[PDB]
Design a protein around this ligand. Structure first.
Ligand SMILES: CCCCCCCCCCCCCCCCCCOC[C@@H](O)COP(=O)(O)OCC[N+](C)(C)C
Ligand SMILES: [Ca+2]
Ligand SMILES: [Ca+2]
Ligand code: NA
Lengths: 124, 124
């Protein structure tokens, strides 16, 4: 679920403010996501978007009709280390893994302030 | 902007986990919406959607080309009371007030956990 992805970005990145840092960043961090992504971080978001599309295409997810941000899963954190619980069934695991992958990706990519809050209509 | 909406909810409702709580509830608290609001809290969200639509069409927001969640405003929290800074320019002030109205409305309306995570294609 989105609140869990938020939890994961705090887990992977200590004092982060996830919605204030990553939403409406570049061309892909946020909703929508169109164009050429503007940096590694943006590419994290674009990969995340492709992951959720693949979720919706996944046979294991056939009974999720809403979008994967509404699918709760099981996860834990340990010293900045995110854990997708083995207890997860197929769809929950896959969506858990999308969020984890993007959580780590955010932590390793450089944050470019100047890419925050672009004019997507012009540049994406 | 969306993080400030979250922070306003935290303000009005000190016990709050706003995404966990108010995202993906009913037919309107989430990705847009449609259908008949399922309860008062859900009507809080329809109203906020409408207010955002109004902002999108308000002359003073004519240079706001992205969604109103991307608009930064100045607000303050103090004693459960939300204040949209009187310094805000007109668009900023309008959207801040949409948000403030919504948190307040969320703080007044019953929360009905059987209304969370609805199958919106089926019930909205
Ligand atoms: C902080 C806790 C509060 C809970 C809020 C959490 C939800 C925030 C979500 C953040 C991510 C952004 C999601 C917002 C999406 C809502 C967006 C919902 O807006 C719906 C309309 O804008 C869509 O209409 P169209 O763009 O198709 O209109 C077409 C117009 N012509 C040109 C074709 C005629
Ligand atoms: Ca996106
Ligand atoms: Ca909505
Ligand atoms: Na935001």
């Amino acid at each position: 679920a989105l609140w869990q992805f938020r939890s994961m970005i705090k887990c992977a990145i200590p004092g982060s403010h996830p919605l204030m840092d990553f939403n409406n960043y570049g061309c892909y961090c946020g909703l929508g996501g169109s164009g050429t992504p503007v940096d590694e971080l943006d590419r994290c978001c674009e990969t995340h978007d492709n992951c959720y599309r693949d979720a919706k295409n996944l046979d294991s997810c056939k009974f999720l009709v809403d979008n994967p941000y509404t699918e709760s899963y099981s996860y834990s954190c340990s010293n900045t280390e995110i854990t997708c619980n083995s207890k997860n069934n197929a769809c929950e695991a896959f969506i858990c893994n999308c969020d984890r992958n993007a959580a780590i990706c955010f932590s390793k990519a450089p944050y470019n302030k100047e890419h925050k809050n672009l004019d997507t209509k012009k540049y994406c």
